[PDB]
Design an enzyme around this catalytic site. Sequence first.
Site, PDB file in Angstrom:
ATOM      1  CD  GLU A  26     -15.862 -47.200  26.211  1.00 31.18           C
ATOM      2  OE1 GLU A  26     -15.899 -48.482  25.922  1.00 31.18           O
ATOM      3  OE2 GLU A  26     -15.982 -46.786  27.336  1.00 31.18           O
ATOM      4  CG  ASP A  66     -18.459 -54.573  29.075  1.00 31.38           C
ATOM      5  OD1 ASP A  66     -18.258 -55.704  29.604  1.00 31.38           O
ATOM      6  OD2 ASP A  66     -19.085 -53.734  29.660  1.00 31.38           O
ATOM      7  CG  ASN A 119      -7.511 -41.399  46.340  1.00 30.04           C
ATOM      8  OD1 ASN A 119      -8.669 -41.421  45.909  1.00 30.04           O
ATOM      9  ND2 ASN A 119      -7.192 -41.879  47.511  1.00 30.04           N
TER      10      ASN A 119
END
Length: 162
Positions: free
Chosen positions: A11, A20, A132
Site C-alpha cells: 500500500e 487509490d 484460479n
Amino acid sequence: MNIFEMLRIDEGLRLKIYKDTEGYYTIGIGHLLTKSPSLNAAKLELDKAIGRNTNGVITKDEAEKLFNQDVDAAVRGILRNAKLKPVYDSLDAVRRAALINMVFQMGETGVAGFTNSLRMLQQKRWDEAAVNLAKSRWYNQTPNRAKRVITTFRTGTWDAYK
Ligand SMILES: [Cl-]
Ligand SMILES: [Cl-]
C-alpha cells in the site's frame, strides 16, 4: 516479515489525501476514506476518523494508528465470517497473512466471492488455487500486487516480498 510489513509494501504510505488505483479518496496506508467523488466528503470522513480538524493532512503516528485499526478489523472480519474463518483456520501462518492482505484490499464481501479459490486453498491445492485466483478482475487490475499475494499462497514463503 509479517502482515504489517507486507501491507506497508503493498500500500505504501501517504500523509496527504490521495486517490487509490480505483480513483477513490484514501490516506495513510491504504485507508479508504470514501467512494464518493467529493473531496470534501473525503476531508469530513478524514476528520471524523482522526478526531480533529485535519484539513487533509495527517501525521505518521495518525496513519499508523489507522493502520493498526484496519489490520485488526480485517482479522476480526475474517474470524466472524462463516466462509472465511474455516479457510483461515486451515492455513499456516504465512498464507494466513496472504488472506488478510486480500481482505484488507477488497473487503470481506469481495474475498468471500472467491469461493472456488478458497475451496482450493482449504484443500491445499496450491498450484491450482494460484491459477484460479489469477482469473479475476483483481489480478487484471493490480497484477504486480496480485502476483505477490498469489505467490505467497502458492509457496507459503515470503519470497515475493524479499
Ligand atoms: Cl475509521
Ligand atoms: Cl499492482
